[PDB]
């Protein structure tokens with residue numbers, strides 16, 4: 001019957017939900033009859049990334065005749081749901097970014113399902129406990145009246161952007177998380193300057209992958225032009241910016257969001273897209289400069305790590321693509337995951 005706390009048990013049910021995984025796949029227009037969850041594999045996802053990288057090549061150097069072949073080859077590897085079809089042509093940068101996002105999600109979905117279908121079968125144990133052990137992550141409930149809880153709720157309360165007011169956020173549960181071996185992985189960056197506690201939102205169907213493997217970088221096969229600042233791990237200092245990447249809705253309003261310790265160090269500051277393969281020498285991260293930023297005077301420290309929980313003000317940056325800040329690291333070892341929040345989205349529309 002499992003002795004884990006209810007919030008932890010409900011989290012485990014959420015992230016290992018097979019129907020949710022399938023629902024995510026059909027949202028990305030995949031045909032489950034031809035490419036079901038069980039048929040999903042890494043080498044097919046990687047091969048799909050490579051064909052998408054060929055489409056990236058052809059788009060950068062200019063025809064609908066020659067693109068057709070490349071577009072069709074992508075749909076061969078990843079069957080989409082169009083019947084007797086003629087599917088839409090993949091011929092622009094948006095098409096590359098949109099399919100890159102699909103394959104990112106399939107990578108983490110595959111991991112979740114592989115854990116579920118690997119391992120042993122014992123009906124004496126509660127499957128909640130069985131699935132919990134597969135995450136290799138210690139999850140504890142943070143007490144609502146603790147210090148760290150008050151700081152976390154204030155971060156959520158203060159950094160909800162006026163442009164994301166179609167919903168508001170309710171913190172249901174705060175979990176303290178510790179992935180196995182991540183503290184040891186983080187050790188080279190633990191005393192590095194400009195360490196910050198930043199948000200990462202993802203759809204719930206990625207979290208089994210994220211908690212088992214950590215936040216990963218998109219692989220070599222992936223098209224670097226599909227990612228605004230190249231292939232790294234992206235964070236925000238505004239909760240609503242990250243919360244938008246939960247992809248919640250009125251008929252699926254429960255989401256999950258991470259708080260990670262991110263060793264930014266010497267930030268390489270950028271106003272517009274820059275599809276880099278590596279940082280300039282001496283730089284440890286990229287900061288996408290937002291038009292708005294949390295008030296730097298209201299910065300507060302939690303366990304020696306800065307928490308930018310001030311209300312949004314003008315940054316003073318003029319010609320930028322970004323409304324809000326964005327932080328990217330290109331080495332997985334620069335992230336130490338600290339908390340996981342379960343959020344209720346109240347949509348006002």
Ligand SMILES: C[C@@H]1CN(C(=O)c2cc(Cn3c(=O)[nH]c(=O)c4ccccc43)ccc2F)CCN1CC(F)(F)F
Nearest residue numbers: 104107199200201216217218232233234235236242245
């Ligand atoms: C979660 C990991 C790492 N990835 C990202 O961090 C990422 C995430 C986004 C979108 N995104 C996002 O999904 N959540 C955010 O909180 C966020 C904050 C600021 C800017 C973008 C955000 C865009 C591009 C990216 F490279 C890409 C997907 N995935 C890599 C994978 F190999 F595991 F698929």
